[PDB]
């Protein structure tokens, strides 16, 4: 699952719905541990 | 992450040459639909 929000509001241009920022979990190099890492995506990339 | 400002991708074309060439291609293709008829250009329909 992705915990995610619109990135950078109060940018009232044509660039508003673009570029959500999202967050998740990822397995580490070694098997049991977990890792959290964070990224940007476009609004056509990912659906709720 | 984004260094700089926020903009979007846009694509410039030359207006007059574009009109010239499309008038050329419609002046061509009037041979295949009668010399007297009215032709119209519309946008995309839809779908995916």
């Amino acid at each position: 699952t992705l915990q995610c929000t619109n990135y950078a509001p109060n940018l009232l241009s044509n660039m508003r719905g673009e570029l959500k920022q999202c967050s998740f979990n990822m397995t580490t190099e070694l098997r049991d541990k977990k890792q959290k890492v964070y990224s940007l995506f476009y609004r056509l990339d990912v659906v709720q | 992450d984004i260094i700089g400002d926020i903009r979007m991708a846009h694509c410039n074309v030359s207006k007059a040459t574009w009109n010239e060439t499309l008038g050329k291609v419609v002046k061509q293709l009037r041979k295949h639909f009668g010399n007297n008829t009215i032709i119209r250009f519309a946008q995309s329909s839809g779908g995916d």
Epitope: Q3, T5, Y7, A8, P9, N10, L11, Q21, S23, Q35, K36, V37, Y38, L40 | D1, I2, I3, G4, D5, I6
Partner: antibody, heavy 123, light 109 residues
Framework: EVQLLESGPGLVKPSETLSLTCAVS?????????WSWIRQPPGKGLEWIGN????????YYNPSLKSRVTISKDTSKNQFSLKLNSVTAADTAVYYC???????????????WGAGVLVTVSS | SALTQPPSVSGAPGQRVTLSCTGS????????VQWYQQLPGTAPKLLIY???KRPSGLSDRFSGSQSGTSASLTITGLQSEDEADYYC???????????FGGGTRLTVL
């Protein structure tokens, strides 16, 4: 919140290996996002220091302080301390430590609630 | 940096004062920011719900602001016992800069 975060001073005045600590009692290390550090010269506004990880693996730092200040943590009992090297400037300043209590502080920030008390050196 | 009302503002129990940080498009376009500071002699810490709204649980029932390409706070209502001072915080798009230059000093009659 439950909190006893306290520091251990050091006088590194004509010398270049600054290393001071802090450690809390309440919660745990991976009970928030990380813990942060801010610096203030006595009369100036604030100077922010980039941050650590903790319940994470990624670090952050500060321009005008690049290749200059190294941050770590110890995970024995709430130690997250610093070994900043080669102090040269006249930045005889106060410090504080901070909690996140945050949402996604992860592009930049949701708000820094850092309590602290008095993290003071005049070195 | 940020342009953040040098402390020549005139505080009094008439509550006519404003707080206005000037920000760039990369400054104000980052996010909502703050008004959450307190007295010197101590780590000046209040909390706000990052803008224009009521903070965590309760800190005060007295605030309220907007944000154009701007960081307002016109504050009006008799709270002269809380004669405190304030600062800023922001995220501008210097390289990854959780950065500001805030500072206030206001007064009382």
């Amino acid at each position: 919140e439950v909190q006893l975060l306290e520091s251990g001073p050091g006088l590194v005045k004509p010398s270049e290996t600054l290393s001071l600590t802090c450690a809390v009692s309440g919660g745990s290390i991976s009970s928030s996002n990380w813990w942060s550090w801010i610096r203030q010269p006595p009369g100036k506004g604030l100077e922010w220091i980039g941050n650590i990880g903790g319940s994470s693996g990624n670090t952050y730092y500060n321009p005008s302080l690049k290749s200059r200040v190294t941050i770590s943590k110890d995970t024995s009992k709430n130690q997250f301390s610093l070994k900043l090297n080669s102090v040269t400037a006249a930045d005889t300043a106060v410090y504080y430590c901070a909690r996140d209590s945050s949402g996604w502080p992860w592009d930049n920030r949701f708000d820094v609630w850092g309590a602290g008390v008095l993290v003071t050196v005049s070195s | 940096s940020a342009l953040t009302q040098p402390p020549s503002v005139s505080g009094a129990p008439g509550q006519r004062v404003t707080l206005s940080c000037t920000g760039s498009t990369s400054n104000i376009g980052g996010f909502y920011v703050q008004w959450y500071q307190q007295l010197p002699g101590t780590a000046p810490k209040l909390l706000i719900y990052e803008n224009n709204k009521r903070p965590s649980g309760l800190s005060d029932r007295f605030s309220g602001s907007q944000s154009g390409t701007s960081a307002s706070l016109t504050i009006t209502g008799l709270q002269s016992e809380d004669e405190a001072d304030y600062y800023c915080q922001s995220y501008d798009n210097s390289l990854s800069a959780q950065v500001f230059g805030g500072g206030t000093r206001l007064t009382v009659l």
